[PDB]
Amino acid sequence: MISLIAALAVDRVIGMENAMPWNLPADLAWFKRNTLNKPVIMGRHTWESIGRPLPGRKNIILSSQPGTDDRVTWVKSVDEAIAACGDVPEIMVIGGGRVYEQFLPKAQKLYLTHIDAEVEGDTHFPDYEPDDWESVFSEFHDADAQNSHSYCFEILERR
Ligand SMILES: NC(=O)c1ccc[n+]([C@@H]2O[C@H](COP(=O)([O-])OP(=O)(O)OC[C@H]3O[C@@H](n4cnc5c(N)ncnc54)[C@H](OP(=O)(O)O)[C@@H]3O)[C@@H](O)[C@H]2O)c1
Ligand SMILES: Nc1nc(=O)c2nc(CNc3ccc(C(=O)N[C@@H](CCC(=O)O)C(=O)O)cc3)cnc2[nH]1
Ligand SMILES: [Mn+2]
Ligand SMILES: [Mn+2]
């Protein structure tokens, strides 16, 4: 089973200049909660952005080129990335925009944070079809001294 996890600002912006232009500790904690002890698939730019392995997860990087760090696994296709996960209950696809586009059609589940922030972007989450997803969990948080925006954690299942 393949899931996508992402945080989306207004207009589905997910990134700018190979970074995420917000700072929400509670959302990173949610990300860690939902990915720990699961393989995480990411594109090379997202690998470069994160800048180091995500511990406690098998990190699988997509690139057409040979790999450049044996602390993670490198693969050259969607099919190869899936296979490299092995027999696991749930594969987490952790972006970025290009990778989300390719895994969206296979995904059974989306873990989306909706962040109340307007930000310029150069990368978006896919413009997916709302009707085809059932919201099964939704949890809103107001901003606080640690988190400058309000945000909502949503889980969607493919209908
Ligand atoms: N807000 C969020 O939840 C979130 C999550 C993740 C990332 N981001 C942000 O998104 C941005 C990065 O996204 P992006 O769309 O620019 O890049 P990306 O999807 O992370 O990486 C794209 C790259 O992955 C490789 N790739 C992808 N599909 C492949 C395939 N089928 N076969 C082989 N290689 C493949 C290619 O590497 P090669 O060029 O080496 O072939 C490609 O150029 C950053 O701003 C980042 O901070 C945000
Ligand atoms: N909901 C969500 N939020 C994100 O920030 C997010 N980020 C990515 C990709 N980028 C990143 C960037 C940093 C870390 C990170 O440093 N996480 C650590 C620390 C977690 C924490 O501080 O609580 C981790 O161990 O997961 C993870 C993913 C993909 N999906 C997401 N999904
Ligand atoms: Mn805001
Ligand atoms: Mn919804």
Structural domains of the chain, ranges and CATH numbers in brackets: 1-159 (3.40.430.10)
Burial grade of 47 (CB within 10 A; 0-12, 13-18, 19 or more): buried
Burial grade of 97 (CB within 10 A; 0-12, 13-18, 19 or more): buried
Q: What is the resolution of this structure in A?
A: 0.8
Q: Is 26 left (phi over 0), alpha (psi -120 to 50) or beta?
A: alpha
Q: Whose CA is nearest to atom 31 of ligand 2?
A: 6
Instruction: Name the residue of 3, 31, 60, 138 to mutate for ligand 2: max ligand atoms within 8 A of Cβ.
Output: 31
CB atoms within 10 A of CB 58: 19
**Count helices and strands in the chain by DSSP H and E runs:** 4, 10
The strand pair at 59-62 and 73-75 is best described as parallel
* Experimental technique: X-ray
Residue 36 has phi, psi (to 5 degrees) of: -55, 140
The strand pair at 2-8 and 91-93 is best described as parallel
Q: Whose CA is nearest to atom 29 of ligand 1?
A: 62
Instruction: Name the residue of 52, 99, 112 to mutate for ligand 1: max ligand atoms within 8 A of Cβ.
Output: 99
CA angle 95, 133, 23 (to 5 degrees): 40
CB atoms within 10 A of CB 92: 25
